[PDB]
Design a protein around this ligand. Structure first.
Ligand SMILES: [Mg+2]
Ligand SMILES: [Mg+2]
Ligand SMILES: [Mg+2]
Ligand SMILES: [Mg+2]
Ligand SMILES: [Mg+2]
Ligand SMILES: [Mg+2]
Ligand SMILES: [Mg+2]
Ligand SMILES: [Mg+2]
Ligand SMILES: [Mg+2]
Ligand SMILES: [Mg+2]
Ligand SMILES: [Mg+2]
Ligand SMILES: [Mg+2]
Ligand SMILES: [Mg+2]
Ligand SMILES: [Mg+2]
Ligand SMILES: [Mg+2]
Ligand SMILES: [Mg+2]
Ligand SMILES: [Mg+2]
Ligand SMILES: [Mg+2]
Ligand SMILES: [Mg+2]
Ligand SMILES: [Mg+2]
Ligand SMILES: [Mg+2]
Ligand SMILES: [Mg+2]
Ligand SMILES: [Mg+2]
Ligand SMILES: [Mg+2]
Ligand SMILES: [Mg+2]
Ligand SMILES: [Mg+2]
Ligand SMILES: [Mg+2]
Ligand SMILES: [Mg+2]
Ligand SMILES: [Mg+2]
Ligand SMILES: [Mg+2]
Ligand SMILES: [Mg+2]
Ligand SMILES: [Mg+2]
Ligand SMILES: [Mg+2]
Ligand SMILES: [Mg+2]
Ligand SMILES: [Mg+2]
Ligand SMILES: [Mg+2]
Ligand SMILES: [Mg+2]
Ligand SMILES: [Mg+2]
Ligand SMILES: [Mg+2]
Ligand SMILES: [Mg+2]
Ligand SMILES: [Mg+2]
Ligand SMILES: [Mg+2]
Ligand SMILES: [Mg+2]
Ligand SMILES: [Mg+2]
Ligand SMILES: [Mg+2]
Ligand SMILES: [Mg+2]
Ligand SMILES: [Mg+2]
Ligand SMILES: [Mg+2]
Ligand SMILES: [Mg+2]
Ligand SMILES: [Mg+2]
Ligand SMILES: [Mg+2]
Ligand SMILES: [Mg+2]
Ligand SMILES: [Mg+2]
Ligand SMILES: [Mg+2]
Ligand SMILES: [Mg+2]
Ligand SMILES: [Mg+2]
Ligand SMILES: [Mg+2]
Ligand SMILES: [Mg+2]
Ligand SMILES: [Mg+2]
Ligand SMILES: [Mg+2]
Ligand SMILES: [Mg+2]
Ligand SMILES: [Mg+2]
Ligand SMILES: [Mg+2]
Ligand SMILES: [Mg+2]
Ligand SMILES: [Mg+2]
Ligand SMILES: [Mg+2]
Ligand SMILES: [Mg+2]
Ligand SMILES: [Mg+2]
Ligand SMILES: [Zn+2]
Lengths: 220, 111, 89, 68, 138
RNA sequence: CACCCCGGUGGGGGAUCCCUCGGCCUGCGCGCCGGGCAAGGACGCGGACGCACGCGAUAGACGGCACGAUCCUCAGACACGACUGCCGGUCUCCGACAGCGGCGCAGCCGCAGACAACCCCCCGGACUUAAGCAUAUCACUAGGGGGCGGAGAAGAAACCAACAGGGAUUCCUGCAGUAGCGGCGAGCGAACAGGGACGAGCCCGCAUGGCAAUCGGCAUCGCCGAGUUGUGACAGCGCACCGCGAACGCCCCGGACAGGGCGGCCACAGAGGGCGACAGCCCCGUAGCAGCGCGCAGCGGAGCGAGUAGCGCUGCUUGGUCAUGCAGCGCGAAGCGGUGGUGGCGCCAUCGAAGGCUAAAUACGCCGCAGGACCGAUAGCGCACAAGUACCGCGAGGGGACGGCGACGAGCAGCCCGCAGGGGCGGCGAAAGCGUGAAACCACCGGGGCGCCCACUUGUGGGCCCCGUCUUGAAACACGGACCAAGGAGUGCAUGUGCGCAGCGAGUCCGCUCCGCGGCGCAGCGAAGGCCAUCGAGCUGCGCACAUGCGACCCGAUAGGCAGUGAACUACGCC
RNA sequence: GCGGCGAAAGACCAAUCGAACUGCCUGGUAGCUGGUUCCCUCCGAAAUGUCCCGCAGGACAGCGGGCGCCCCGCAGGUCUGCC
RNA sequence: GUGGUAGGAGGGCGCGCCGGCGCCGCAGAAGCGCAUGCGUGCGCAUGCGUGGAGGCACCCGCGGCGCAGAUCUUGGUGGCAGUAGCACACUCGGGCGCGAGCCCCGAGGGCCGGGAGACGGGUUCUUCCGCCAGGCCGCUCCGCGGAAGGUGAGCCGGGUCCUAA
RNA sequence: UCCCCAGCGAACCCACUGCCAAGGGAACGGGCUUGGCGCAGUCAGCGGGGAAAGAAGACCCUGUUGAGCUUGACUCUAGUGU
């Protein structure tokens, strides 16, 4: 909007005092420029990249919220309240053994989740794939689908290859749990399947009551 | 200005003030890790760091603590039994302008 | 007098075709192009921020530069006939 | 909560009065006029702003004077 | 997921790559599936369609028709099959443009060196299957 | 009858919505011009060729290699290789010379010109802030001049320090909005540390004298030259670098299935795009999968830096203060000298200037690539379109507008009328017939006659001046407003303060980094010497309000400056 | 172009002249004019004081609102009494 | 208990997009038009028509988030208004032609410049064909549209010449 | 010329506009109040009114907004001179 040599024509010409585009012989000539109310004008208060895009949060408070979002996954009234179909699932918290890493092909992994009663959960997510309802479909966000099972694992039970392609399955290492996985959409109670390696590490990452965490320094 | 507040010391009067944003900060970190890995692979047996001396920090605020110095003096390398030019060929850093001040810093670095 | 009558006398043409820049800006009396500054050796400092966008490098054919981008992309191997002859010996 | 602008849509003179106004810089820029027209602001809230106190130390050293 | 950062999942760049594809790429994008009788012989999933290819139409108005490919047009991406036609007003029969994805090849043409090109994809598929067999063996 | 209002149909116009081969932003990569004729221009080049784009008399695919069957408006071309891709040839003319410079020099070379984001050197404003203003500020900026490179510049202490001492530069954090400068006003404002990224060190000169041991050139193992006014030294590079990639059928609706229903299947592949609606299995793709070699030899090493440093004066500059830097001029050193926040002198301490080189971390546009809580055709770049185009200006320069049928298969001219444009019966298609088609407005038709509010039995009564605005006071003979659509104005950052919320709490703060003993707080007072509690909840984040600096709610001066362009009008002088 | 040129009118210097035109600084600054976009609910002013090259403006105070905390008796009043 | 400007506060309505979560759509989405209903109000929901591919609700989060005004900006459209205005020294006959006040021919009556160069224009020149567009009316005409054709130098002008300021 | 016609065909301007009298009112109303009237909405004249349209009054004042110009203004400065 600022790429003109525009000046106000002043008063006395029976026209408003807005900057007019200089020159003659074109339709742009004499038209208003530079103003937010002008066509092809600069928008007033233009957006800058020096905007504070990130927000700071205290690390201990973020760790408490990660703990409370983890406890939400252990409450079966919460997990079915956020849309997870957990009628077939055995326990919540469902913990699978560390022989989960012996599944090599995802056909066997889909069969494994099937015999855990997650078949209705995975099928709900796979059919929920629809085109996004706004202009976000122009901006490389065309498809939305629901959030299904989260599988939390550790480095001794690495099931990344055999499970990542199943629709409705997210995988997260236990050493780095974000809240984007634990309460996606700010809605507590994500359906989480644990491996035995990730489940036994929870008393190391967050410790027990009244005690410091062994793996996280200075966390209670 | 109006009310009771600390007097404003905001220095944005110059229209020549630039802004250094940090959008490259996660990307520079992954570039920095990749170069460190490629340096370690270029010098596979040799350590990626030099051996650096233990020096005492300068002022009265900081002379309670020691940090890691820039290089050993040539008189420290000689007392350890090395020529300082040979000492640079193995992974030892050599500082020609540090002065051998006292026996405690000398004998610690020689050891 | 000052206006419509005086425009009848404007039949001289002061700025003619520049032999360097090709704009109708070479003055006949001054013997200097008002656009590019010919016959000064360096180009005239362009009178606007948009004038580089109209007349600067890249706004023309870039006949040599498009060739040297293509050779630089391939590693400056140069003449394909002479490339095999240097490779044999 | 949202900003104040989202409630002032619809009201002339956004929040700054019809008779007064939101003009550009009445009173001057910054903290000027501390001895002329904002003297009441400086007599009240910063009575030690103007003047000099004490012996100047060109380059006070923090680490040398460290004694907590 | 696509783990290759150097390829686009961008819609804008993928759409621009489709409509401003060059003629070498437009031949590949006009591939068509083989029959099951061709896939037992050749092995590959699909092959780029050519003139004089026998074709069964799989979708659209002419679905279930068989005919030879009489015209391929890379710009506008349309394959014209014999006996998939519509008349103009002056009685002139025009072949109707069908997308190559809606055609299944029944019999592959093999005349103009195409049997070499089919065997080149067949052998590279057979060789790459041998490497993946050895890698999974080890 | 006109007029007005409401509706219907038709116009009118292009809002809305949906779309998007475009933009914007961020990251990464690249960072490669030029007498071997550059940038830019001029003119030409297609069988039918205007524009655009491509190209250069080898002129609209010339060669090699790869690809492998179409290109298409006509005509034609084509396995003796269509259409393509990569690379190379060819590459007109104007535009870099009154050229300038190096080398004994039969001659061989270089400089010029482009680039202007980043970087280095010089020159250097004013608007602005100070509620005026002159110093100050803006700002050692903008701008102009010069010069490089893929980075540049800097750089191995005549440094910091005052310790138990550190140890090139650059960058980050931090010191710190601090010390300090400042009509001590407005305002401005660093450094050592500590932590970190990255790390790297070197060289010329005073080199032999039992012989210049050194180099340049050549038509070359021999000349000629340089040179004693002094020449002299090898550790790093290079090549290779793929082609293939899983898995779907039936029924319904429909112009068409990617939809719905049922049943499977593949997945180290359920990223994305195409395909006649919304596809893991139709297609393109996607996940997945591949390396290496070759080198490093010798003979001086205490060499040392002068019209300088410094002092005096001056001008500029800086936070730099009885001078921080820089320059000019005067004076002009030493064997010891410089410095110690910068008066003199003395101490003590610490370094060695007036010669040179040096990676990395750092900066950055074009361009390429990839992304995005961005914009979605009055938006987003000025340009989604024959956009720096059309067009305007003597000139420097200025600079728009304009997107959308469908299955790109059909979409025609049969009959009647008209010179014709066309009309009417038809025709194609699911429909639209260059999407949707709002409002202003208009035609006709139909209905009805307050502009609004109230009341009811709908035409009566009662109540109502024109909104916005400034104002003591507007219906005002105050100003703005023809109508309608779209657009259109308190935002962003920094720093505070207050409140609320949140985590922890004598502590607290992840986000500079590969790892904060950095900040603030646990206690203050004083100019300081000095004194030191009888004593106190904070730190960090999030949110709002508010203050200030910034374009600062939006729009608006007359002015001022810097750099340019014009005597085609006109003024004068000359030929 | 703080320049030209003028038988002098501040005339003329490209329809521009008591300092041309172009681009930039520049979104110059404006105590001045104009405008400042949803609804309902709760409350609701001031046009005064002091100072200011202050008088079309500010800052402080007063008045409005919002948020609080604390249990201390509160009053634009009359009566009685003394000044 | 109930007015309210400047003003402050609260709770909602509405818009673009986000993370979720419930869904809808070629058996017709958004948008639009007209109705009906709900609503103190912002607004919401439905019906019918149109439309032809997306959309809705809620919870969250981000914000270039709501217009009657700015001699607002851009675009479109009215009234004004079939108004102001636009050829009014020509006349008669004939022709071509669908069509004639203006085009052509003949006659009569009038009027005034015409013809060569420069600068400037650049194909306007000339021929053939056209027109339902342009020409302040009309046109069969044309400086218009389309297709062509045309510019030949020792002697003309400039350069290969000379100098002027 | 106007006027009337065929063909062609704008602009200014525009909150909205039945007309008066007095009153009140921002102290000179088209709209308000109370009275007086007129209304087929057409053609041509016309200049009383719309405090008619032009143009963010050029007069005047204000601005801590200018510029031109002057000098015994303030602070500087080219030039001349020492
Ligand atoms: Mg814009
Ligand atoms: Mg939408
Ligand atoms: Mg003349
Ligand atoms: Mg001339
Ligand atoms: Mg206002
Ligand atoms: Mg307010
Ligand atoms: Mg006032
Ligand atoms: Mg005063
Ligand atoms: Mg109507
Ligand atoms: Mg448009
Ligand atoms: Mg970029
Ligand atoms: Mg060339
Ligand atoms: Mg070829
Ligand atoms: Mg140069
Ligand atoms: Mg400014
Ligand atoms: Mg000022
Ligand atoms: Mg001011
Ligand atoms: Mg002033
Ligand atoms: Mg370069
Ligand atoms: Mg360098
Ligand atoms: Mg400064
Ligand atoms: Mg030597
Ligand atoms: Mg495949
Ligand atoms: Mg000197
Ligand atoms: Mg000394
Ligand atoms: Mg000191
Ligand atoms: Mg040195
Ligand atoms: Mg639109
Ligand atoms: Mg645009
Ligand atoms: Mg003009
Ligand atoms: Mg339409
Ligand atoms: Mg008032
Ligand atoms: Mg008044
Ligand atoms: Mg009013
Ligand atoms: Mg009045
Ligand atoms: Mg008006
Ligand atoms: Mg709007
Ligand atoms: Mg602010
Ligand atoms: Mg302005
Ligand atoms: Mg000034
Ligand atoms: Mg100038
Ligand atoms: Mg006079
Ligand atoms: Mg003039
Ligand atoms: Mg502004
Ligand atoms: Mg009240
Ligand atoms: Mg008063
Ligand atoms: Mg006023
Ligand atoms: Mg106050
Ligand atoms: Mg109320
Ligand atoms: Mg209010
Ligand atoms: Mg919506
Ligand atoms: Mg809604
Ligand atoms: Mg806005
Ligand atoms: Mg509007
Ligand atoms: Mg308003
Ligand atoms: Mg009109
Ligand atoms: Mg008329
Ligand atoms: Mg006449
Ligand atoms: Mg003639
Ligand atoms: Mg002619
Ligand atoms: Mg015609
Ligand atoms: Mg008429
Ligand atoms: Mg009257
Ligand atoms: Mg009356
Ligand atoms: Mg009349
Ligand atoms: Mg009148
Ligand atoms: Mg005025
Ligand atoms: Mg004043
Ligand atoms: Zn030129």
């Amino acid at each position: 909007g600022m790429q003109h040599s525009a000046h106000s024509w002043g008063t006395g010409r029976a026209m408003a005092r807005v900057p007019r585009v200089s020159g003659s012989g074109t339709t742009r000539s004499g038209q208003g420029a530079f103003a937010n109310f002008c066509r092809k004008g600069r928008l007033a208060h233009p957006t800058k990249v020096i905007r504070r895009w990130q927000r700071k949060f205290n690390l201990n408070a973020k760790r408490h919220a990660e703990a409370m979002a983890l406890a939400a996954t252990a409450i079966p009234p919460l997990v079915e309240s956020r849309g997870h179909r957990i009628a077939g699932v055995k326990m919540i918290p469902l913990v699978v053994s560390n022989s989960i890493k012996e599944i090599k092909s995802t056909k066997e992994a889909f069969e494994m989740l099937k015999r855990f009663g997650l078949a209705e959960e995975l099928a709900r997510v796979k059919e929920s794939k629809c085109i996004r309802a706004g202009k976000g479909k122009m901006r490389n966000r065309r498809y939305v689908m629901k959030k299904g099972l989260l599988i939390i694992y550790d480095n001794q039970s690495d099931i990344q290859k055999a499970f990542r392609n199943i629709a409705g399955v997210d995988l997260a290492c236990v050493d780095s749990l974000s809240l984007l996985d634990l309460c996606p959409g700010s809605h507590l109670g994500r359906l989480v399947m644990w491996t035995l390696g990730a489940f036994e590490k929870l008393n190391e990452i967050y410790g027990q009551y009244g005690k410091e965490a062994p793996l996280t320094s200075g966390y209670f | 200005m109006k009310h009771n507040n600390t007097l404003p010391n905001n220095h944005f009067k110059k229209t020549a003030i630039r802004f250094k944003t940090w959008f490259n900060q996660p990307a520079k970190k992954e570039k920095r890790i990749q170069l460190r890995k490629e340096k370690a692979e270029k010098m596979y047996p040799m350590p990626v760091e030099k051996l650096r001396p233990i020096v005492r920090c300068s002022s009265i605020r900081y002379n309670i603590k020691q940090r890691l110095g820039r290089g050993f003096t040539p008189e420290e390398c000689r007392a350890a039994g090395l020529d300082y030019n040979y000492a640079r060929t193995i992974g030892i850093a050599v500082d020609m302008r540090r002065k051998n001040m006292n026996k405690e810093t000398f004998d610690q670095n020689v050891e | 007098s000052k206006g419509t009558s005086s425009f009848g006398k404007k039949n001289k043409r002061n700025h003619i075709l520049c032999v360097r820049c090709g704009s109708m800006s070479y003055h006949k009396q001054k013997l200097r192009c008002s656009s590019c500054g010919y016959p000064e050796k360096k180009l005239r400092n362009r009178g606007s921020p948009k004038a580089r966008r109209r007349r600067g490098e890249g706004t023309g054919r870039m006949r040599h530069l498009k060739k040297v981008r293509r050779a630089a992309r391939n590693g400056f191997k140069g003449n394909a006939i002479l490339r095999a002859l240097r490779n044999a010996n | 909560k949202d900003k104040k602008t989202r409630k002032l849509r619809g009201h002339v003179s956004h929040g700054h009065g019809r008779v007064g106004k939101h003009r550009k810089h009445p009173g001057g820029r910054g903290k000027c006029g501390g001895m002329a027209h904002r003297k009441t602001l400086f007599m009240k809230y910063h009575p030690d702003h103007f003047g000099k106190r004490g012996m100047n130390c060109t380059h006070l050293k923090k680490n040398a004077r460290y004694a907590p | 997921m696509k783990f290759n950062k150097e390829k686009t999942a961008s819609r804008r760049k993928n759409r621009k790559a489709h409509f401003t594809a060059n003629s070498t790429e437009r031949r590949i994008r006009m591939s068509s599936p083989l029959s099951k009788e061709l896939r037992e012989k050749y092995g590959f999933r699909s092959f780029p369609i050519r003139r004089n290819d026998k074709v069964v139409v799989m979708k659209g108005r002419f679905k279930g028709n068989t005919g030879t490919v009489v015209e391929v047009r890379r710009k506008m991406y349309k394959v014209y099959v014999d006996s998939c036609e519509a008349s103009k007003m002056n009685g002139r029969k025009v072949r109707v443009g069908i997308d190559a994805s809606n055609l299944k090849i029944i019999e592959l043409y093999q005349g103009d060196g195409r049997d070499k090109i089919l065997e080149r994809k067949m052998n590279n598929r057979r060789m790459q299957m041998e490497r993946a067999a050895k890698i999974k063996m080890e």
